[PDB]
Ligand binder design. Sequence first.
Ligand SMILES: COC1=C(OC)C(=O)C(C/C=C(\C)CC/C=C(\C)CC/C=C(\C)CC/C=C(\C)CC/C=C(/C)CC/C=C(\C)CC/C=C(\C)CC/C=C(\C)CC/C=C(\C)CCC=C(C)C)=C(C)C1=O
Ligand SMILES: CCCCCCCCCCCCCCCCCC(=O)OC[C@H](COP(=O)(O)OCCN)OC(=O)CCCCCCCCCCCCCCCCC
Ligand SMILES: CCCCCCCCCC(=O)OC[C@H](COP(=O)(O)OCCC(C)C)OC(=O)CCCCCCC
Ligand SMILES: CCCCCCCCCCCC
Ligand SMILES: CCCCCCCCCCCC
Lengths: 174, 315, 52, 208, 117, 52, 52
Amino acid sequence: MIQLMLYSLIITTSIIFLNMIHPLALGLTLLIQTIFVCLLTGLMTKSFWYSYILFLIFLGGMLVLFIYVTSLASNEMFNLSMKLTLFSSLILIFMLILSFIMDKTSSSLFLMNNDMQSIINMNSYFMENSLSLNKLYNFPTNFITILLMNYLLITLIVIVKITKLFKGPIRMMS
Amino acid sequence: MFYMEFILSLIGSLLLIICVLVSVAFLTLLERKVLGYIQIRKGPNKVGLMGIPQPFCDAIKLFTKEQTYPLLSNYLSYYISPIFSLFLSLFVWMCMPFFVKLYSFNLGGLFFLCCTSLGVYTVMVAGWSSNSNYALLGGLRAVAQTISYEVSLALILLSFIFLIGSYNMIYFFFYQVYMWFLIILFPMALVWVSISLAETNRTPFDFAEGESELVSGFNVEYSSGGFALIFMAEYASILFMSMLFCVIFLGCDVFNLLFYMKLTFISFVFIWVRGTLPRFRYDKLMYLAWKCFLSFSLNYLLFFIGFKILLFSLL
Amino acid sequence: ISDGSSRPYRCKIKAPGFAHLAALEKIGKQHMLADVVAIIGTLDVVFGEIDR
Amino acid sequence: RDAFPNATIIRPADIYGSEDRFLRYYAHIWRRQFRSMPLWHKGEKTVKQPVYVSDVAQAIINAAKDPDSAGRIYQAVGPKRYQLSELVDWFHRLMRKDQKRWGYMRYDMRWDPTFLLKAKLNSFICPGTPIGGLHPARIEREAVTDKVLTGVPTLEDLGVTLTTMEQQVPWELRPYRAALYYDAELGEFETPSPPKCIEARDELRLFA
Amino acid sequence: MFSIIFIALLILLITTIVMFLASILSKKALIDREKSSPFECGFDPKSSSRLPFSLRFFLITIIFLIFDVEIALILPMIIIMKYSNIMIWTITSIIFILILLIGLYHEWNQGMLNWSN
Amino acid sequence: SGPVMYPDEVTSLWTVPPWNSKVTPVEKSVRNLTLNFGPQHPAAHGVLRLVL
Amino acid sequence: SLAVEKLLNIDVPLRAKYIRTLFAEITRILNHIMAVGTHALDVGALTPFFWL
Ligand SMILES: COC1=C(OC)C(=O)C(C/C=C(\C)CC/C=C(\C)CC/C=C(\C)CC/C=C(\C)CC/C=C(/C)CC/C=C(\C)CC/C=C(\C)CC/C=C(\C)CC/C=C(\C)CCC=C(C)C)=C(C)C1=O
Ligand SMILES: CCCCCCCCCCCCCCCCCC(=O)OC[C@H](COP(=O)(O)OCCN)OC(=O)CCCCCCCCCCCCCCCCC
Ligand SMILES: CCCCCCCCCC(=O)OC[C@H](COP(=O)(O)OCCC(C)C)OC(=O)CCCCCCC
Ligand SMILES: CCCCCCCCCCCC
Ligand SMILES: CCCCCCCCCCCC
């Protein structure tokens, strides 16, 4: 029931996100979108780690983007429309009705949770995020992690090169 | 899941919310009394019996004064942000390590970091939507403050987690049965006290609400309820990081009254730093949390990585 | 300056903070806003004598 | 007039000013419904002659200073007559609430049964003043048409000049403008046209 | 997590009831023309706060974003120590923290952690 | 010597790109934010208006 | 008083001179305590304001 509610909320916020001209409307819409996407991703995995990781990522990213909102397109008009509110309300109540009259066994995800796994699975009895995150630090794929460290260092070098700090601060009509 | 659980989880969460709110009110009373006694003067003494119903005087007045309907503001975004600030500042308190099963937070550090990042989001939304220059300056100071302390707060937490081996804060209790972690982590007792004041926007890092650099910071257009929920959100954040100083550095036991005496003492320390040290500049805050705190966090993380490999071979 | 009568003809008060607030424009330039707040204090300037 | 034999009775129309009920009633959220404006007969059949408040106050001063005004009835109306639809459209043009960007539309209040129940609930549940000045007495006060009586002196007999709405109401609807957050330039928002004034022959053609 | 959703909705509901009770019991006075105006320390503003704001710490913000996704790869290895090869875990962990120290000290050497000015 | 080989009606109003590939950006005027430390501000000592 | 006494060509006694000197330095302590407390409020230190 909660998964179908998250489906309906993600659909309604995606309709809202496709229709917003103002960057702050897009920012708040993608705030509630990443909240609902973080909860939905959690439902699929045995543990709740990557939802938390994705939330730290997408709250570390738009924290910067608001500073660029206040530095570029700080002055732009909001335009509320009754058509979008009526459309979102009608679609939202229609999908809550459709989710209430639906069989929730057929609409549930086939991905296995921590309790959907059987009792005979001895790997399920370990600590909940151990075997999932193991291959980041194991022998076949530590070199991809090495490549990611060097990639992030090269990324930082690129950011320093193409954002020249000695040219001055950035604003509109600089 | 048994039906009674859900009922007792709801009851314990609501009782925790009510007790944290009344403790926020008496934390304002405690700050106004000892912060006076930091100086020569006294605290509130006349109203009520001995100043005890003084937060009730402060709460009756702020719930009856006229709501500001500002002109150039976006009122539909200005009205909602203190509600979300109090909502996350009380929602973070569900992470509290209960010896009974309140909530089975296996990922309490990540939950704490998420609500920590979201509280400053409410602060910077309330700063922008007031449509005042001092409010926008306080909001941008809050964004620069959280960009300064966020990665430093995370890496310092990881070092404590390494001493635990798990992300569940009740496992802080088993590793502190013989002694407190104040013996090992005294440089990050200082560093986590520095970060926790930057988390709660408190002196020496009070740029989001400045009384001399700006005029009340981002609270310049908030009055009579919006200011009240912003103020309780800030003081519930102060209570939460006082609790987290008591969890990590001190005993994580909750069945002793000495834990709550220690929490009142760490709250007194939070008042005590404000009454002694002057405020920084947020230029020096950004030069501090990027070149000193982050480097020390990475270095002592290396020290804990080597010590945990040394300890694991001996076991 | 006095014209010999019972009243002074003209009394001019030299404000110590007048020249300090005059050179505030050069001293406080290229600084932070918090640096301007401290500078205003460092010059000592109550504005009763400045405004006369 | 029976009890006090020589009383300067002044009859004003709807009075517009700061802290009034006339502009603040139309500008309020509770009067409009979902960014749409309900009016009786779409505002076409109601003709009003509103008066500015300092004109009424200066008429009171000039009636106090003049002893010849005792035992008289003085009509207090403005210089020009308007109908309510043109007045409301001009108010929303002054408020930067147009047809396209804000979604302002005008519809007849007689087909709306929600608004009268909302006004009755606002008059019932409020312990003091109703929210926005919304009550059925205000609905009957805006419903009636402003009619002057011939042979009864106006404010020009008291020596006071009259203030047109084009001098004050563009200033008076300045705090009630929509999108005040936008740092507009000089040519961003066009100055709206003044509203049409109804004449005598148009009024007798409308009321027929 | 379903209980956390319900208690988060209850906290949001309780805070909205608290704010609406603060709005209902507030003193209802008439709105003046210059009461609603932005404060700006008692004078006229001359400029809206929607005017563009100068950013002197753009490089520090993007370095913060890069360092935060670097934080997102450190948090696993608390759990991974007890279940992996100790040699590979130490090579990855000490090489991770030393590469971060090379990057941070190199940008300290260039002075790119100082605000543009 | 044109911008293109065959100038159309829309295209012929264009100019030639410069023979040097480098086009230096122009220096445009900037209007900074006018904030006053007005009289109510505690750092402005009560009666000072710094039009920063 | 020194302006009016220089215009009047009169001289103050030694006891009045010592009273003026003593209260001028008491007045100096008061101005400096005011300057230190004002600069501490502007910087951010709440406590030496009351302490002085
Ligand atoms: C030289 O030149 C100069 C001049 O020229 C001469 C000048 O003139 C000036 C100007 C200076 C002056 C005019 C005077 C000098 C100024 C000062 C000395 C100011 C400095 C002093 C201070 C700032 C005070 C010290 C600071 C303190 C004490 C910190 C605390 C201060 C507060 C304001 C906090 C109080 C606020 C509160 C308590 C908010 C209220 C909210 C609540 C109480 C909410 C809590 C709620 C509850 C407890 C209960 C709720 C429960 C709920 C909802 C649930 C319950 C449910 C149930 C069912 C029970 C200057 C600067 C100058 O330099
Ligand atoms: C994570 C991000 C999430 C983002 C999405 C969040 C969405 C949340 C839901 C949004 C819903 C929006 C609904 C808005 C309705 C009101 C619209 C509005 O703007 O109202 C204006 C009104 C007065 O403001 P105005 O006069 O316009 O002044 C501005 C001038 N510049 O403003 C007001 O009057 C203020 C509002 C008052 C509301 C009072 C409601 C009536 C009382 C309700 C019951 C209270 C009961 C309390 C006691 C309970 C006891 C059990
Ligand atoms: C209005 C919402 C504000 C944002 C909340 C963000 C919460 C942290 C991010 C996240 O995804 O956390 C995953 C966590 C996963 O749960 P945990 O892994 O923390 O705990 C297991 C859970 C009963 C064992 C402890 O979920 C939440 O925090 C619930 C959020 C509810 C939101 C309600 C409104 C839609
Ligand atoms: C949210 C929908 C509000 C609808 C208000 C009434 C509209 C009537 C339109 C009549 C035809 C123009
Ligand atoms: C709250 C809904 C109000 C709708 C008002 C407009 C109705 C239009 C149709 C009328 C048919 C008689």
